[PDB]
């Protein structure tokens, strides 16, 4: 549903049918609300407890198709460009892609075969390094985030005498903003996420209606403007 | 029932009987609300938790006959047109049809016979690639969504020394919009999902009354225009 | 109860006894409401959870007599007229009758005797085709809906080395509309479901009173016209 | 109406339908009364509470056409010639146009961007200068009037770290006098506002009737000589 339709049905659902019509929204306001609804819906549908169904990323066909056009596969770049201080003497630092929203699968290709990366918590790190062995299980590797600047930097811990060749990350791409019109203006160029040009919703058309409905709900909550509406609809930011 | 009957009965149910009759809706507004109701009804009826009966796609004769006119069978196109970075070294990339709404059944015909595709979750992917074997069961194949642009791209994982001949996908076709009248205008051509011409409801007449009722409910909720109505009737967008 | 009486007692129950009489309804409005009530009552009484009793199609004598004058027996036409792509290499495509509302019994007459058709779900299809045999039980056959255009197209899967001779479907016919008067007019011919002429209620007279009562309830809900009435009586569309 | 029409038609209204029945006004007196009447009309139709409709400058199409030929756009000139003392540390003194009657819109073009000027009262200045930050909002600038000599001088308090490059003022131009004859011909050195020659009305013809009627009322009151009439029609002088 290209952005002109986003604006047109936004008007239709917002004010064109209201009994006491509210002032129509500017295109910047509609773009901001649509982008906010996009992020809110993505976070709602990624986590099962964020929506009424209780279903997450791959808990039904609908969720799979929802995040289908947002999934991306990239590689981590070895961070030997500059020195650094790792928390572990035996961890190799890798930089994840910049346009990363959420990681759902990671894998490392070593000389000793491919191994699934298990992101270990700070409590599991302390528990596991109190043990005599302190290495992953046969077909897995460990991961902990390290000092990150401008992008997520990642420490990979593999078994001894293993060299990493590739480090693939299957992640959810950061959604691009929904901008209806060229936001360029003589009085000042405004941006949604650093882009002023027209930006289509690059997700599957299945959730475009949900994004529009959430945008309308946010618009009406802003219209009322009391604390109750803001807190009630702010619970779904998540 | 054809588009004329949708519009006429929409007027009848909306404002021709109500005491303090409200302004009649424009045909663009009626078409918008009918299309939104169509998508909402489809999403409610696919998921058991989305409707009051607790019944999903195939949980009763009515639910079968509801989507009977929306089911379609196609084939995935092998994505060797251009190079790409697969998350799994032994996965063949396939492109699904553009007009895909939900996948309900997939199957792949290999040299070793037909094999049912099981869409494995990311947590199930991590669990399964931690085992020594890392291959599907005898009569199945595995599947994960990969980098998708403009249409869903799919990674198929089969057993070793197996070649894929075809990849059939039983999916639900994307519903076409319901447009009452030719939306062509001298002041600007407006579209619902990229089409301005008249578009009939391409689903079974069993749910035409259902779509009309949902459209009327959405129309009256928009008429009320308060945050309450939008929030409570957005719960059914799903 | 022929349609003149439908209109006369509709008036009597709607406005002729009211203290502050509402405007009388047009014959088109009454026809639309009666047809809507007809479909709503059929769907109420087919599914047990749709009515207060909790009784479905054949759960009491009343329901049997209710759907008695709506049941029909027809045959499926082999769809070798044109080529197609079946989801199963070994399924024969058959086209169901056009005036089909709900299927309650299906059967196929093969050279190896008659067999009851079991409509298998998309989950049962995946479960059953993961098994070594992948054929029906002795005296049954499987069924899944395929690409359908203008009428439900059906795939029949029988055991190997079995040829289908007949395919009988015992279904519930689509109800004809209730039209009181010839809706032909000089200002434009209106239709309920594509027919303008007088149309009697072709169901058993047992549910005519229920259809009239539901029509009156819909009329009064439309008269009030608030969102509450529309949503409350829209739950019974089902 | 040319000046000759204002004089001739004053006598169809003041002088008892040009009957020489009322006292008889010279052309200098008629010019004086017309000038006073136009000033009164401008002041009354500007303030909503000053007229009979409760409508101000831009509150109806008639008011928009009334002041259409007075609205002027002019730039302010930096008052760097005189090194006076400003009440605010970061105030740049600007001189306004000499033919200024009422200001209605002011804007300042800074290096950061254009900023709408808010004419801030002496109470709001003390209120907003009792706070931590003490700067305008991101899209506005303040303005207070300062030591003025035979002109209008305004302090532009724009946010620190910003420089003013322009200052546009949209205002109501001071109306020119209405004079119906060369005053020097018969009256020695009398001027209305410094002009001794024929001066036409610089206003839209829509309010010429209003101005003439007000002049007639003022003449009749000034000649009836009652204190009550003078004080009663003195109410509308503002």
Numbering used by the authors:
A (entry chain U), B (entry chain E), C (entry chain U), D (entry chain F): 1 to 238
What does the published report state?
Virus ΦcrAss001 (Kehishuvirus primarius) was the first representative of this order to be isolated in pure culture from human faecal samples. Here, we present the characterization of ΦcrAss001 using cryo-electron microscopy (cryo-EM), enabling de novo structure building and elucidation of functions for around 1,440 protein subunits constituting the virion, leading to the identification of a novel ‘crass fold’ in the distal part of the tail. The virion possesses a short non-contractile tail extending approximately 44 nm from an icosahedral capsid. The extended tail barrel formed by widely conserved paralogous ring proteins has a high capacity for storage of cargo proteins alongside the capsid cargo zone, ensuring that the proteins required for the initial stages of crassvirus infection are carried inside virions and delivered to the host cell.
The portal protein’s clip domain interacts with the tail barrel, which extends approximately 23 nm towards the muzzle protein complex at the tip of the tail. The barrel was reconstructed by imposing C12 symmetry to a resolution of 3.20 Å, and with C6 symmetry to a resolution of 3.30 Å. The barrel is composed of five stacked dodecameric ‘rings’, termed ring 1 (R1, at the portal end) to ring 5 (R5, at the muzzle end). These structures are formed by four paralogous ring proteins: R1, R2 and R3 are encoded by genes gp43, gp40 and gp35, respectively, whereas R4 and R5 are both encoded by gp34. In R5 (gp34), residues 15–26 adopt 2 conformations—5a and 5b—that facilitate binding to the 6-fold symmetric muzzle complex. The tail barrel and fibre docking hubs are stabilized by disulfide bonds, notably between fibre docking hub proteins, the fibre docking hub and ring proteins, and between R1 and R2. Unexpectedly, well-defined density at the inner surface of R1 and R2 of the tail barrel corresponds to 12 copies of an additional α-helical segment of the same protein, gp45 (residues 214–245). At the end of the tail is a large hexameric assembly of the muzzle protein gp44. A further region of density inside the tail was observed at its distal end, next to the ring-joining domain of the muzzle protein. This region corresponds to 6 copies of a 14-residue segment containing an α-helix.
